[PDB]
Amino acid sequence: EVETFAFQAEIAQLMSLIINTFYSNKEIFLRELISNSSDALDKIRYESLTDPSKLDSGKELHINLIPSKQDRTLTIVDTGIGMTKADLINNLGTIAKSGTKAFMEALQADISMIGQFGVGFYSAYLVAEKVTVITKHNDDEQYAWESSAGGSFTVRTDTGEPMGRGTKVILHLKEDQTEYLEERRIKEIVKKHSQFIGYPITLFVEK
Numbered sequence: 590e591v592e593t594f595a596f597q598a599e600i601a602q603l604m605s606l607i608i609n610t611f612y613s614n615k616e617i618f619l620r621e622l623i624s625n626s627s628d629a630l631d632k633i634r635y636e637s638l639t640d641p642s643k644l645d646s647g648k649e650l651h652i653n654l655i656p657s658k659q660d661r662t663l664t665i666v667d668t669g670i671g672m673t674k675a676d677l678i679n680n681l682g683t684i685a686k687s688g689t690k691a692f693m694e695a696l697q698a699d700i701s702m703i704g705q706f707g708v709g710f711y712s713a714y715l716v717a718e719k720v721t722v723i724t725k726h727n728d729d730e731q732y733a734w735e736s737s738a739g740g741s742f743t744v745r746t747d748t749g750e751p752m753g754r755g756t757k758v759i760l761h762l763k764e765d766q767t768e769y770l771e772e773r774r775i776k777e778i779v780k781k782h783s784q785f786i787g788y789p790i791t792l793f794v795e796k
């Protein structure tokens with residue numbers, strides 16, 4: 590079954606602003622998603638220090654960047670702590686409320702400071718018409734979150750191949766944003782914004 594939810598009003602407003610504002614510096618989305626992955630890897634690494642069984646779902650802590658010109662997608666994969674169903678439906682949005690209000694006040698400021706308000710994920714909509722999030726947290730099931738904005742998102746149990754643990758952010762890119770599938774563009778962005786991330790970042794090459 591697919592459940593459909595309304596974004597909190599302030600998050601719907603933020604998403605419309607990101608989608609509708611003229612802003613050429615769209616590449617900051619990738620640094621924000623890599624930062625989220627790094628934070629998630631930090632969290633599971635920390636938790637493993639007192640409960641080693643937390644890594645039974647996979648010992649490798651890494652980030653993969655996977656472009657697909659065929660699917661017109663850029664996928665950011667991590668083996669971090671992952672998100673629970675409650676994370677996806679309510680709890681992360683609840684935390685994002687205060688940051689969203691503060692960010693939207695500041696804009697009224699540059700869109701590139703979005704990460705300093707804890708809502709960097711939504712910068713994905715600078716480049717993506719739809720975002721699909723596949724995520725697996727220890728002691729919860731594997732879920733697919735999805736939204737093309739417009740005020741709603743869906744959550745379902747994922748039937749795709751299992752992940753073990755972590756999060757895959759699948760960016761279904763807008764037609765005019767296919768530069769983010771080019772190897773040299775991704776390398777340039779990571780080198781400029783994410784050169785000091787403390788986990789291996791592997792940029793997959795297309796076949």
Ligand SMILES: CC(C)(C)c1cc(Cn2cnc3c(Cl)nc(N)nc32)on1
Pocket residue numbers: 625626629667669670671672676677678681682710722734756
């Ligand atoms: C999808 C939606 C619920 C809207 C979201 C996603 C984020 C950012 N984020 C929070 N926890 C995360 C983990 Cl565990 N991993 C990664 N990669 N990202 C994470 O915030 N909200």
